[PDB]
Design a protein around this nucleic acid. Structure first.
Length: 159
DNA sequence: AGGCTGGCAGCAGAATTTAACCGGTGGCAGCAGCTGACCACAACCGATT
């Protein structure tokens, strides 16, 4: 499926350019690896081509995905558990899934709650992580000028 | 049939992994609103030599 030069999305790290395809040997068989150059912390990720779907690597979403995530990002009736730990584990396991809709849900919930009160060290760190990978995936989805994409996200969040 | 005493050997002391809400209360700290006494410059007196 994957080709050299494709821009795929890794689950917990956001965008990833597939820059080469290695052919390393483990247990005497040439399981080909693909190397991904993510840029969040400048790490090179190597995965087999077989377990790409098992680890859940995923192509970027289309314009139906864009209107779907904007539709879910502008939606009310988002009642949350009042317990701080329950809420934290809930949106952490939403963030770790790798779905654009779930990441947009986490950034809209924490954005409205930060606009309300301003939460915490851990939740501001989580909102920064989630919003930066959502901005990176959006800029990958439309080739649309990083930090101007941030202004786009701020505008569609503030509405 | 057992037992309690002799060297005997070993040991101790002394010297030179992760965080966050929520309630509620006492202390702080600053500031008009009186002060209520303090301070003072100046002027006005009470006999008295």
């Amino acid at each position: 499926i994957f080709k050299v030069g494709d821009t795929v999305v890794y689950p917990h790290h956001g965008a990833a350019l597939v820059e080469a395809i290695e052919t390393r040997t483990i247990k005497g068989e040439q399981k080909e690896y693909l190397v991904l150059k993510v840029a969040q912390g400048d790490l090179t990720v190597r995965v087999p081509a077989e377990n790409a779907e098992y680890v859940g690597v995923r192509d970027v979403v289309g314009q139906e995905g864009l209107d779907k995530v904007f539709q879910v990002l502008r939606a009310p009736h988002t009642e949350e558990p009042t317990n701080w730990s329950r809420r934290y584990k809930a949106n952490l396991e939403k963030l770790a899934s790798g779905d654009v809709n779930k990441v947009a849900e986490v950034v809209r919930d924490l954005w409205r709650r930060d606009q309300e009160r301003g939460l915490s060290a851990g939740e501001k760190r989580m909102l920064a992580k989630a919003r930066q990978i959502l901005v990176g995936e959006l800029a990958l989805a439309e080739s649309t000028d990083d930090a101007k994409a941030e202004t786009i996200l701020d505008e569609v969040l503030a509405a």
